[PDB]
Ligand binder design. Structure first.
Ligand SMILES: CCCCCCCCCC(=O)O
Lengths: 238, 39, 247, 281, 247, 39, 247, 39
């Protein structure tokens, strides 16, 4: 009953027959900006189905020595579909996100991935006093990789990362993780090209292993923006 | 008693005993029943 | 005027005092509040979230390898697999956890703890383990026949991947202290040990060595007292850029 | 789900259990939820009316302490020439920094206490001036420049013989809360600083000795303490483990040897079956 | 007597404090109040009055020539006529205006601005212009096809001599700051540009170069915070006669 | 509370929120209607 | 503000003052109270318990031998057996008793005292004694004919092993003082003497020398005033380990 | 009057005049009557 799930948004839908319930970050659900919290006075555009739908990113391969992967939001989607177009033509944006991470193998494989949504995941650089640069942070649709997952690449720890909204993909138990993210920021809206509200991290705490036939085991990420709103229309910063 | 005209000047407010651990401990859409199998 | 007299303590600056003080910017209007997800009002809310114990804190285990305990198919019976020092004041597997980190900003504690273990082997792997909590007084048990006499849970691997061992608050005094003497009667919590109840059994194509991830958290009957500076952070020099803030 | 909690929860007595289909001790960590197994379901318990309080862990109390945020020594003599400027930040002293960084967002007013001490190179009872220079305002260039007339800036004049000066700075962010962490860049171009939200820019604290120099020199040290109050906090975070390296970022290196080394946070024990402080009788 | 104790802050002189203090002249009877025209109670009342922008702040333009923008009959189409830096903290066309001067005594601001332009050519001169406000994020537009995508007003010269371009408050945060870094995300307001929609067309006896005067003012949804000393005035010496006041 | 006998000794009076911008923004004898041509 | 002025005494530290003072640990929750046997609320409760008088404070008597008075079968009549100095300020048999020790933390006292003696000879031993309290004024009586004129109790040994002599509060002034001058009219309490009324008579196989143990306590009409440091304890050097507390 | 927020900061409490000497002077199970032989 809580192992099967279908998510439908816009012209897109996803089903899983091996889910583990699903997480609603901090027990919240996405919503449009109410009049009593609004700041920007221009009438916003709410494109609905053209932007609030699942966008599937390129997959990554789970290898025996993988350290983990990460994708920042909205950066990862800032150049995809109509969500990307609205982001480029508008100074301000606001939205929640429905995240669905996918990874299947066989009943002979073992492995466990921590799938966590980190708010304001400010990265640190290793063994230097120089702060991370633009290209170290903005990876776009391709996402990045963890250098030292043990400390979440920020001098803290993955051990305590469970304090953030998360799920796990334990091959023996499930083949997907689902997390619903509400707007998370100190402002009602923001400029999408210079700030990322959330960072999706997928880290193999227990490495992939088996003694059966070796096969490429991918990890795929599908993300659907929710309740998108845009303000401050102008030309595209394409 | 705050004798200053600006409320932000007042002493600390140590009376908010409200809590909701579940937003961190049980952020799952479907409530998990006591002894019933979670999956 | 009003006749008055100054008391001892007059003029002092106590870092934990609580008084109103002059507003620097009169008539300042702070930004309106906005609802933000995840508000936390009591630190006890944070320590109730389970986090990973660094059980494999051994030489040769690097980074994340220290966060999982590997168990193998045994050739002998009733084998001891691992134990967990319940040290919170002294460094150990429980120190870098949400409950451990926050508790270390305090001196006294009381309440039940819960350890949850998730089996991360393959679906075709089966097994039964016994997790035991031994109240203080003696030496850590090294045989199942002895450990089995304490508080425990026999765990059968299956659809439900995880098991919980409750470490109930069993203490003579209302609170225990995070005292530097680990063998003190007001600090030692006892031990946690894990033995094979049966054995880890897997088919030829499943890996024959599987990992467990152990988590720990406080229950809502927990309480912390006497705030102190945490021993987990310190500095001996100015941080880079600190002095430049004056230039 | 939300409720008023003033004491730790009580325990209810429990009996023997042998029910098919009921397994409270089994859980599924994969859901992301923490185990909901109660002590009463794991073992047989007695009834306990728990009176233990939970007020010392209230966020207001946890963060409600005056902590050192700035310390500056300078020479007071005939010529930092009798004054200094400090670009305000809460990242220079690690005890306060680590605690604030246990949260993602924080909204609070800040009580500021200024403590001054002097040493001869008797002690003069000097008068000092601490002026708050907001972003965009001009900072003093000399102990005697016109800037100190402080026509609009807030200034506080205090003597070394008086108790430490004190005042409260209101929550002044342009947003609804301060961003303790900021995964973004401060500017519209690509060369801006990463991890520094412009919105949380306070300004500069300019401090000078008002008195003209004496015939001899003195070393004056000014310590500034900050105590947050009327606090609201959101989204707790993993505590810092690696030593801090810079006030401008979360860069890390780790200690040379455990504990808190990049390769091992917890110190090593001989093996997973070795009990470190085992009781030997 | 009453037992008391002095708190930190005791004895200090905070320039923004607010307390009563001893009257120097007891029983003094101030002159009766009389009604006087033009009372102002909130500085926001002053910044709502439009004042002239110094748009032609270029070398070669002296005094009042800097307060008007000359437009000529064009030979080409869709021509860019001028742009206006929306810098208030940094020096620019908006700095010496009522809204600019008063706002600079503060650090934070929020609200809509309005720019009004009055065409001062002859009655026989006709034309259509397009005024555009471009929210921040990119480079200032240099072609009408690009500028036209932002907020704008197409202006037709006629009986009503002036047009108003509203620069609506469009910001992510509640307030913006008068930060010294003009490219900061918490300060940059965007751009204002002006292009010919058609062309300035005049008969032989009308001057072929006409002037526009641009004004700016805050709307009543405006708000300022965090008072500071203005960077617009300073002194390095005693003013003439200052010392003589002591002789 | 002012404990001095002369009222001018009292602390500041920051409670006058009355405004009338129109004496500066619209000092015209004939009120100008919203969208109606001013001239 | 409020006009005030400091009074003499301002800033002083009086060890007996009573004021509230800043809590070092805000929001600290003390351990819940639990019922504990033997709560004492007024020191007068303690001095009402009788304790042993060191009547045999003589050279040759060591340790516990000093706490019992031996009486023997007499050859002569009306023999004086022992007397008890009623000195509390000066060292004497009453000093190291519950009433004596606690009273010495004070300067003034008032109330009745009670002395109880338990005969500890064998069951076959018989006898009659007379215990006398002589109010002050003269020399201690040395003959029964004289002592007998004061307050007294004739004691017959038997089933009930103990007798009580009440030393009623008989004083001109409301209180007496623990003055260093034992012969002062505001301090001297008088004397207590014990004589054979008949004789101690025992059979051949019973010991011919028997012991008495004398106890003393205050009655509930007792009262103490003017607290002072007790002369019963002092130090001239650091105690062992005191300085090590700083290392 | 304690002006601090924590009650343990208050001045001394010198108003508890309750006593029960008998817990020390007569801890015997059977009450001893005035003049009646104790044994
Ligand atoms: C000493 C003035 C402090 C003003 C408030 C500073 C808040 C900083 C919050 C943070 O980013 O950690």
């Amino acid at each position: 009953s809580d192992r099967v799930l279908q998510l439908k948004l816009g012209n897109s839908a996803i089903v899983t027959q091996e889910a583990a319930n699903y997480c609603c970050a901090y027990g919240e659900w996405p919503n449009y900006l109410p009049d009593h919290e609004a700041v920007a006075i221009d009438k916003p555009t709410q494109p609905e189905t053209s932007t609030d739908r699942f966008y599937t990113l390129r997959s990554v391969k789970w290898e025996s020595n993988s350290t983990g992967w990460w994708w920042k939001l909205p950066d990862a989607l800032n150049n995809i579909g109509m969500f990307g177009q609205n982001v480029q033509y508008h100074y301000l944006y606001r939205s929640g996100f429905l995240i669905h991470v996918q990874c299947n193998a066989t009943k002979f494989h073992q492995g466990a991935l921590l799938v966590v949504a980190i708010p304001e995941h400010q990265r640190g650089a290793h063994d230097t006093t120089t702060s991370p640069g633009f290209n170290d942070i903005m990876k776009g649709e391709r996402g990045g990789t963890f250098n030292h997952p043990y400390v979440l690449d920020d001098g803290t720890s993955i051990a305590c990362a469970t304090i953030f909204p998360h799920q796990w993909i334990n091959l023996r138990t499930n083949n997907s993780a689902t997390i619903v993210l509400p707007w998370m920021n100190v402002a009602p809206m923001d400029f999408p090209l210079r700030h990322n509200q959330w960072t999706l991290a997928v880290i193999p705490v227990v490495p992939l292993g088996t003694r059966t036939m070796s096969s490429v085991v991918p990890i795929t990420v599908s993300i659907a923006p929710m309740c998108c709103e845009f303000n401050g229309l102008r030309h595209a910063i394409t | 008693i705050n004798f200053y005209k600006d409320s932000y000047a007042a002493s600390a407010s140590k009376q908010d005993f409200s809590q909701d651990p579940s937003k961190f401990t049980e952020p799952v859409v479907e409530g998990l029943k006591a002894g019933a199998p979670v999956l | 005027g009003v006749p008055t007299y100054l008391l001892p303590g007059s003029g002092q600056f106590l870092t934990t005092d609580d008084h109103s003080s002059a507003p620097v910017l009169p008539c300042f209007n702070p930004t309106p509040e906005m609802h933000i997800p995840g508000q936390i009002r009591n630190m006890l809310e944070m320590i109730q979230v389970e986090s990973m114990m660094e059980i494999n804190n051994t030489d040769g285990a690097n980074g994340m390898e220290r966060l999982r305990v590997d168990i193998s198919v045994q050739a002998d019976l009733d084998q001891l697999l691992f134990n967990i020092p319940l040290d919170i004041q002294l460094d150990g597997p429980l120190r870098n956890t949400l409950v451990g980190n926050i508790s270390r900003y305090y001196t006294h504690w009381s309440g039940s703890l819960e350890m949850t273990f998730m089996f991360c082997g393959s679906f075709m792997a089966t097994g039964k383990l016994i997790l035991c909590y031994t109240p203080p007084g003696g030496s850590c048990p090294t045989t199942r026949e002895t450990a089995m006499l304490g508080t425990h849970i026999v765990w059968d691997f299956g659809l439900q991947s995880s098991i919980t061992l409750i470490i109930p608050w069993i203490s003579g005094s209302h609170y225990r202290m995070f005292n530097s003497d680990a063998k003190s009667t007001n600090a030692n919590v006892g031990y946690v040990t894990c033995f094979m109840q049966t054995n880890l059994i897997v088919p030829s194509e499943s890996s024959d060595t599987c990992s467990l991830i152990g988590f720990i958290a406080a229950k809502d009957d927990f309480s912390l007292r006497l705030m102190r500076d945490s021993p987990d952070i310190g500095q001996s020099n100015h941080l880079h850029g600190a002095e430049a803030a004056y230039q | 789900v939300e409720s008023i909690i003033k004491t730790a929860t009580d325990t209810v007595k429990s009996e023997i259990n042998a029910e098919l289909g009921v397994v409270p001790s089994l859980n599924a960590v994969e859901t992301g939820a923490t185990s909901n197994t109660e002590p009463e379901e794991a073992i047989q318990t007695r009834t306990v009316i728990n009176q233990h309080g939970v007020s010392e862990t209230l966020v207001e109390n946890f963060l409600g302490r005056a902590a050192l945020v700035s310390k500056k020594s300078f020479e007071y003599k005939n010529h930092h020439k009798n004054f200094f400027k400090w670009t305000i930040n809460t990242k220079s002293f690690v005890q306060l920094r680590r605690k604030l960084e246990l949260f993602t967002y924080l909204r609070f007013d800040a009580e500021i206490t200024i403590l001054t001490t002097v040493a001869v190179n008797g002690l003069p009872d000097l008068t000092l001036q601490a002026m708050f220079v907001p972003t965009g305002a001009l900072t003093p260039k000399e102990q005697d420049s016109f800037h100190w007339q402080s026509g609009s800036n807030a200034s506080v004049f205090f003597k070394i013989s008086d108790p430490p000066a004190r005042m409260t700075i209101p929550f002044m962010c342009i947003n609804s809360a301060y961003s303790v962490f900021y995964d973004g860049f401060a500017g519209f171009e690509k060369n801006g600083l990463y991890g520094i939200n412009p919105a949380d820019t306070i300004g500069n604290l300019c401090v000078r000795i008002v008195n003209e120099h004496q015939p001899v020199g003195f070393t004056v040290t000014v310590r500034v303490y900050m105590k947050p109050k009327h606090i609201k906090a959101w989204a707790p975070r993993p505590p810092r483990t690696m030593p801090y390296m810079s006030i401008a970022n979360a860069n890390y290196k780790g200690r040379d040897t455990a504990p808190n080394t990049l390769n091992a946070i917890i110190g090593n024990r001989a093996s997973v079956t070795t009990m470190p402080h085992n009781i030997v009788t």
